[PDB]
């Protein structure tokens, strides 16, 4: 729980950098919440917000 404080902010920055305009912000907030509570794979994190 202490670690999670930065985690959501860090994942969302990564996701927005990977997708750019293709990623809806509140949808990325969900990726961050899901992946900061449970270990996700590299494959999921990078493509969840923009699979195309």
């Amino acid at each position: 729980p202490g670690e999670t404080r930065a985690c959501g902010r860090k994942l969302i920055s990564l996701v927005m950098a990977v997708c750019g305009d293709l990623c809806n912000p509140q949808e990325g907030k969900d990726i961050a919440t899901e992946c900061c509570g449970n270990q996700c794979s590299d494959d999921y994190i990078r493509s969840a917000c923009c699979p195309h």
């Binding site: 202490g2 670690e3 999670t4 404080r5 930065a6 985690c7 860090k10 994942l11 920055s13 990564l14 950098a17 990977v18 270990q39 996700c40 794979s41 590299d42 494959d43 999921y44 994190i45 990078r46």
Partner: protein, 208 residues
Amino acid sequence: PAKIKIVAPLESALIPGGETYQLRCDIMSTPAATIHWKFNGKLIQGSNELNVEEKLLNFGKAIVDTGIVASILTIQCPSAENSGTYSCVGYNGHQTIETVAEVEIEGEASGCRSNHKSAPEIVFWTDSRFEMTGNVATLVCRANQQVDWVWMSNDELVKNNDKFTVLSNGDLVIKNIVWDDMGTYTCIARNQFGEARQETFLYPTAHH
């Protein structure tokens, strides 16, 4: 597959002389990128060096190696000598990206004392690093002066052991990462003139 991306390019700026001014660039990259800065095409900060020692420790493995690195360039006493072309260059061994901006100083800096006997600055660091469980990862901090390093993980001191290695250049090497290693790692740089701290973040991704 290698990818490198600037988060926000530098903007041209007219700045008052004698007042400290700070440029920043953030770069997302796979594999890890290094950042260096040029002034009118000449290197003024950072290096081209990559973390080959970690590539060795992961030799033969599948490597995720993704994240964002950040860097700051501080112009202490902006004078006419400092008007020109500023460049932030990202490099990951396969790809290079460069963002370039014009900085024009209006005025001079006769009063300004500059960074004489000033606290250290952390000018480059791992903002986030993603790596697969079971691999070695590195969190980077670099200072603008010779410093001694101390690392914290989630408010707990990091000591050298079979897992962690605090290198004298400011790298934190973490062997055989597991999900519990996830979180914020704080680098503390000290010299006789003060200390600087910077937070880095590590995410051990799932093994598949």
